[PDB]
Design a protein around this nucleic acid. Sequence first.
RNA 1: CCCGGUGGCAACUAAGCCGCCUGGUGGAUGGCUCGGCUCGGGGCGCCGACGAAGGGCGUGGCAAGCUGCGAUAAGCCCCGGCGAGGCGCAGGCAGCCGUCGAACCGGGGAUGCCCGAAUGGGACCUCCCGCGGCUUGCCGCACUCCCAGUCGGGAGGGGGAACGCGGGGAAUUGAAACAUCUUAGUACCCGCAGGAAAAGAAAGCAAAAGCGAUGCCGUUAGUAGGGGCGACCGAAAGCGGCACAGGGCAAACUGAACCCCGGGCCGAAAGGUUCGGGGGAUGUGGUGUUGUAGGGCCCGCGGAGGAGCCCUGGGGGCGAAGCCGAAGUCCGCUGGAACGCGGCGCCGGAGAGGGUGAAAGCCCCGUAGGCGUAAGCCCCCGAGCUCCUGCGGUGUCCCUGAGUACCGUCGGUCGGAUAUCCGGCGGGAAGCUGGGAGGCAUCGGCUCCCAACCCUAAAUACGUCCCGAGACCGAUAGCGAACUAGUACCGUGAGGGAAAGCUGAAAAGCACCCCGGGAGGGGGGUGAAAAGAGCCUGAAACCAGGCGGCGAUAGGAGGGUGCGGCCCGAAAGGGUUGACCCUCCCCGAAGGAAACACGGGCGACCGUGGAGUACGAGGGGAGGUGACCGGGGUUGCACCGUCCGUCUUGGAUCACGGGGCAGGGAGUUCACCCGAGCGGCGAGGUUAAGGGGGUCAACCCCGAAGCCGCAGGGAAACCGACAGGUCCGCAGCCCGUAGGGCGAGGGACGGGGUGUGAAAGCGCCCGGAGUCGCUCGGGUGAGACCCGAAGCCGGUCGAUCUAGCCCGG
RNA 2: GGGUGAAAGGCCAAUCGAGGCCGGCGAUAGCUGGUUCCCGCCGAAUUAUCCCCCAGGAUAGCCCGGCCGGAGGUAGGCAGUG
RNA 3: CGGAGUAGGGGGGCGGUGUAAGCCGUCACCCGAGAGGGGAACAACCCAGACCGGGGUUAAGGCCCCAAAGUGCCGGCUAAGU
RNA 4: GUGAUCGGGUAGGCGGGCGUGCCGAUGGGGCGGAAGCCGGGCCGUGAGGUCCGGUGGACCCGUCGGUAUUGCGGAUCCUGCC
RNA 5: CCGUACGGCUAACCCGCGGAAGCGGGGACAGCGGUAGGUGGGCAGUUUGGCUGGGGCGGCACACCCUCGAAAAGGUAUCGAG
RNA 6: GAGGCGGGUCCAGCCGCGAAAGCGUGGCCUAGCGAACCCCUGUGCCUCCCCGGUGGGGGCCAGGGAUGACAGAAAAGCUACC
Lengths: 120, 148
Amino acid sequence: VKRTGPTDINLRRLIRTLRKKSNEEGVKIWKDIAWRLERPRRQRAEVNISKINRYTKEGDVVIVPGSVLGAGRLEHKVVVAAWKFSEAARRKIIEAGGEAISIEELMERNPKGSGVIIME
Amino acid sequence: MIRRRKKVRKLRGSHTHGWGCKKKHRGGGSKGGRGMAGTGKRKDQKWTWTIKYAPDRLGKRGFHRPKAVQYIPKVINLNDIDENFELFKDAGIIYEEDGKLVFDATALGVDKILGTGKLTRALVVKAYYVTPKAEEKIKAAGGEVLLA
RNA sequence: CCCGGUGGCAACUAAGCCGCCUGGUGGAUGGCUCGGCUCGGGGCGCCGACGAAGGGCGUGGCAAGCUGCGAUAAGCCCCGGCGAGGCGCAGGCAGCCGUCGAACCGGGGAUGCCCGAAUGGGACCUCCCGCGGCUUGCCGCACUCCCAGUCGGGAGGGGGAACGCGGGGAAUUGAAACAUCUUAGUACCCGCAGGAAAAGAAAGCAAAAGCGAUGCCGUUAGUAGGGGCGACCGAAAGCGGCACAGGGCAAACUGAACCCCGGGCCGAAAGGUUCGGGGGAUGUGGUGUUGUAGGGCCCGCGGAGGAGCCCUGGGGGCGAAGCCGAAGUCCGCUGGAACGCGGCGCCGGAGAGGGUGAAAGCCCCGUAGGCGUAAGCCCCCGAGCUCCUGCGGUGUCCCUGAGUACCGUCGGUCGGAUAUCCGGCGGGAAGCUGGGAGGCAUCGGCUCCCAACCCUAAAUACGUCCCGAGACCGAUAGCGAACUAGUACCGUGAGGGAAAGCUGAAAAGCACCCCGGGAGGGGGGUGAAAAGAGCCUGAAACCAGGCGGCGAUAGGAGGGUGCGGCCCGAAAGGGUUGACCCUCCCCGAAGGAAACACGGGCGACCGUGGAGUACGAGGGGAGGUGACCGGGGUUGCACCGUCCGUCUUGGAUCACGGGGCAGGGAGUUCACCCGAGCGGCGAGGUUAAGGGGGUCAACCCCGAAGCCGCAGGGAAACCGACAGGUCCGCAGCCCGUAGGGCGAGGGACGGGGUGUGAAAGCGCCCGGAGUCGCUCGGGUGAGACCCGAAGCCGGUCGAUCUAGCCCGG
RNA sequence: GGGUGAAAGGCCAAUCGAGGCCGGCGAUAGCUGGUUCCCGCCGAAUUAUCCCCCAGGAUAGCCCGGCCGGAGGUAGGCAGUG
RNA sequence: CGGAGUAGGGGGGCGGUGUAAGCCGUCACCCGAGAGGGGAACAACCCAGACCGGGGUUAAGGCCCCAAAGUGCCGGCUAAGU
RNA sequence: GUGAUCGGGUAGGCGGGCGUGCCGAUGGGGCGGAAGCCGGGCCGUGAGGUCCGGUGGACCCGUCGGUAUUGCGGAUCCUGCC
RNA sequence: CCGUACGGCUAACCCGCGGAAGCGGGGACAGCGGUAGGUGGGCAGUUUGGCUGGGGCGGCACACCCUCGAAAAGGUAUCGAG
RNA sequence: GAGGCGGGUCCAGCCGCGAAAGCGUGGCCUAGCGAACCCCUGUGCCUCCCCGGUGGGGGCCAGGGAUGACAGAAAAGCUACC
């Protein structure tokens, strides 16, 4: 069966933007994230708060190529970029001192994406 | 969303509609018998399939007790106490006494406390039964059990 | 200008072949629709001895069919409405009815032949034959039963699509055969009711808590359970909702205090009161109707049965046929006709739908919205009138449903399993100091109830009828039937069963002349147009004539490639703003000559130089010329070519199917399971039935009952876990100049829960991703992509053929 | 599944080794016939075990499409160990 | 992870059986499911695997006429149309 | 940009397009002549689309998104005509 | 106590003749109902295998072990040999 | 690709032979037999509808009883009327 891509044109536009940004800034990460967003919907990435806590430390920056969900705890402060956040996940990240932002915001604030952790 | 068309539309002009020779898409003989025919017990045309993909379909094993006697008890784990701390507090369950903070069985009625998770707090747990690891973790976090 | 003889031609020939045109034949396609199908709504919902449904025969001035009516016969009388024409489908000749209010609509009366339950008695022909009694004219005279009683008064019988209650009861089929099973308490048969029927007020459900008559909807659940434990079959309680309602006998005690029919009176009447009869002591009426209880009796204090019914009176409301209901036919062009085009205005709580000589808010009906209403019905104020009556308890006092409960056995049935219900046979209780149930029997506890007698609305099912609506069909479709259709027609009979739509705005449906025995032909007319009833459009196959090309020395499935001849043209293709053709200059891929000078070889030939020259697909330029080209029909020459579909190792086959044309004609729907492509929420996700609102089948809100998941292992009792301890390492990041590090996802160790086991070990599981939708692919079951059996089973019809027997010839 | 039969399985309305009509019935078949537009990308098999199996079916082998994962693999040859 | 089709094979080479034709297996080049050029025509013998329009060179085989290209060259044999 | 290491194909799997009837929207045409029919041109690998002329006399098409009794040469197919 | 066998009786039941009352004959048997065993193509439903140089009879090399066939790894069939 | 059958290498227990090292899970190796359902025996535990006893029933483990058509129907013939 033909693998169409996503039907949200906002995601399609984001993917084009990521590829162009990687060609321009001279890096590999934005391309990587684009091909992970262009993955079939039944196989897309889902990550709970507990995994981020387990594998991060104070002051880390994380990119998730999918949804972030709420199950578990966060015991420090992190900056999480994701395509989608749940209400409870957003609430818990805002508590604990962190920030829950979008991939476009992150590419503005860090064009090279230096230091960023891919979590999928 | 993705509204693809049916393939009879593409098979107009195929002459056989994917089924092969013009003799192969007939009645029950073309399936080897109707339904679960031939699965063994009298005839064996689908016994090879039975022994690969469906053992324990033929035969009997065991006994069931009546529902009038079956009792299914409610249980809870410590991870869940710890992650619904605030709701249990906003509603009755978790409450204060003279000295300490105390958890009560009576949320839905729970006969057992099972010991998966961990405990970050001191707690005075009321429960008809509590498992050894659960009691020990309560201790190691600075609380007590009072069975009821 | 003489002759005679030649080789290529010419050119004209017949049948026949291809193509085009004009006609004939035929009735497709298109456009249209007073007819069908489906869903909603609950409008309406039984007819019949007061002679039904169904059938036969009659009935019109001219009348065959359908429709309507019944010897008063396409109709007779009256009361209201409407407001001038009318005399069925049905476009005629003669006439009649109507303004003294018709036709039509609503309500109500009269007449109403024969058969038919068919009923005074009989039917081989829907026709015949009698009794009485009263005066031809009239009523009555069936069977079975109740009340009676030698007088009479009553009931039943037949019909009805689907829905309803009670009995009797197959085989095909599946199990890849078949016998238990399945098909199936199905098809079909018999009986019995209604607008609904049936059920229904715990000798119940449950289980340490409690519920509280019945019926219906969603879940419980493909679960408990049945079963050659196979194929398959298969509930209930509980939970969430709709809708709500409870009353009466038998007996104990009393003992005629009672009911019905007729006549004499009173009354609107509820119903009183009198004479004469029928019932009833084998008990009419009063009482009373339930769980360790209720009632009776017995003591006693209390004596709100007063709720219903009748309508002189009365108001309101529902409720008709029926009423009212805005705004341009304004000015030009086209046209047979404006509803068109252009211009200029208006109404709108009305721009839904339809009609009118073309596409209309303003021409008409209507529509949005305001109106009124006789009977008939509801509400209440008043009017006249009724049959027994509470509370609290004492008692060695009475009562509370028998071939019943229960046991055994046989047959059927059920998921009901040692534990479902029904029936037959043999046994057979207690009976208030009593009795029953709690999934094998029995003993003891505890819990819940009182059978063997009766009635009962609402919520539910159906649509032979009516109403509205539609991603339904649009005359081979859609119901079989768009129409004089269950009709014509076929069969001894049960029974079977078609075809068939359209002139035009208006009949204006061809006046008049010639020919013809006539049907008709030809001239003339109507009309915007013959569209001429053999009537909208008018395809193909097929046929005739005309035109063009071929056509009597000739060989292949009817075609393909290339080169030519005869003929025709539109301009949608091109072209004098240059067709075709002729010559010269430049670049040029792969490839690649000859003449000629020398030489080698017996020779056919070769080598060297000429020469990588002259040429060469193609890519550019310059001048002479002045009008075709591309295309199409048919046909000649040369080369090539054994049709189409099918199974089959193998088809041109002497293998099967294949005269021509047009229209029709085959993977659908539901339930369950496995996957995917996308989307929403997310340790949670999602509502079902139903309810509330609205501009009322669309829209908005509520509703988590339940289902999946969040913890598993185990036949069961039961027990009950890593939200990260170590390492390798893809992407990626960091340091750098190769190397070196960190490393989600992934992989490997280690550790935990449970089963087994003496244990060690081994299995399954454990470090958070599922759930709800839309579409697609597939599996299983159902007719399951479409057609085809011989046969098996049920109920009915037939002995005018033929076989046998009887009576009379 | 009955009749009738000087017995031939003869006759019972052109129908008889079990009539005819309607129904169950759109019975069932492993057997026969059929299954409607275009262009591109890939592209087989008739062999093993089991079946009252041999004109049928199941489990594998041979085709296609998609996803995961992340560095070696192998249809040929040379030299060797066996 | 998902969707299939296939359970009648044949020519040619190898083996067993059989008088033989054939039967039964095996190899896996071809036909099946494969156009084009040759062998007179030919399923599998030879050359050679095919988008379209053009220009050239070769393969299998062939060069008296039918029929594109030799009545080709040198040495020898056959008298039977072999 | 690369393709000496892409260009046959039965059963069969996968991808993109043409055509038919009805619905929600949007853009439009029609008595100065719609659909349908006959004969001819141009585009398109093609399924097909569109224009010219003639006949006819009242409705029809394009695009986006949905839906379906959605495509015939054949069934000793069915109905009708020859 | 209950039985078995026999003998008798008549009043149930049966038979006949008669409007009926009865009369006569049989007789607790028979018949009727319920259950248990036997016999039972009178009547039904079914089954009656496969391989096989056609089928049939024949034969079971119809599940297994060893040698050969068997092609110097593995695999390999015949109503093939022992 | 496989139910059942057969064989191999071991870990524990309790034992035998042997001075000991060692060997022993039948027969020097390769033939000597068999699903579901039901039943019988052994053994110790789980369980039977509100609770508790008694008799009886169900379940788990092991051994056994058979289908030679041996991956397992309970089963005789004729058709010349067909």
